[PDB]
Design a protein around this ligand. Structure first.
Ligand SMILES: CC(C)(C)NC(=O)[C@@H]1C[C@@H]2CCCC[C@@H]2CN1C[C@@H](O)[C@H](Cc1ccccc1)NC(=O)[C@H](CC(N)=O)NC(=O)c1ccc2ccccc2n1
Ligand SMILES: [Cl-]
Ligand SMILES: [Cl-]
Lengths: 99, 103
């Protein structure tokens, strides 16, 4: 619960019965995780980053545990190089950025 | 506090920065290794670099030892200049203003 930024802020997540590592990312609007199957229905979405846009699958109301905190919300699945926890779920677990 | 704000993440964590004499808005971004600013003029030597993120890579100019004011806090470090859609303050400078994640 107090994470400095001299290293990447990586945490463990539990999603679709798997443990994975993910990046706590205040610069991401959305949560984007590498290809895997999830227990739900999806719809298409386009999202942008540095370097253009990618197609992802949008899964709503997904149960995901981040550093032991449970969230239930939208997870995007697509060709990201790193699993990213964005503000939609950072807010659910009560994360803040402090000076 | 006003001098050391606790920033909630309901909205994008945007702040005012001053760089190269100019005021700009930038994103405080714990998920970025580097600080990347839109095309602008900076002094000194630079070297070309490729940096990547979600969509792929962009070519930037790397400048070292740049002074930047971030929400009124002084930080010095490398700044990459290039075709980023959003100015972002990455971990190399967030550490210099004592930023932490808390939950
Ligand atoms: C994740 C998504 C919802 C698409 N949002 C974003 O990606 C938004 C888009 C915004 C507008 C365009 C400019 C970027 C800002 C902030 N970003 C969030 C932002 O936090 C984003 C998230 C991220 C992390 C790691 C890998 C990829 C993507 N970081 C980045 O784009 C930074 C840029 C940099 N410093 O070089 N990338 C990295 O720090 C980084 C780290 C490891 C990597 C490994 C392999 C390939 C690329 C890698 N890039
Ligand atoms: Cl959500
Ligand atoms: Cl630096």
């Amino acid at each position: 619960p107090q994470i400095t930024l001299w290293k990447r802020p990586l945490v463990t997540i539990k999603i679709g019965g798997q443990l994975k590592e993910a990046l706590l990312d205040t610069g991401a609007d959305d949560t984007v995780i590498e290809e895997m199957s999830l227990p739900g229905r999806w719809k298409p979405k386009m999202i942008g980053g540095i370097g253009g846009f990618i197609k992802v699958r949008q899964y709503d109301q997904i149960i995901i545990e981040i550093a032991g905190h449970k969230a239930i919300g939208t997870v995007l699945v697509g060709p990201t190089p790193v699993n990213i926890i964005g503000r939609n779920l950072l807010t659910q677990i009560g994360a803040t950025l402090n000076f």
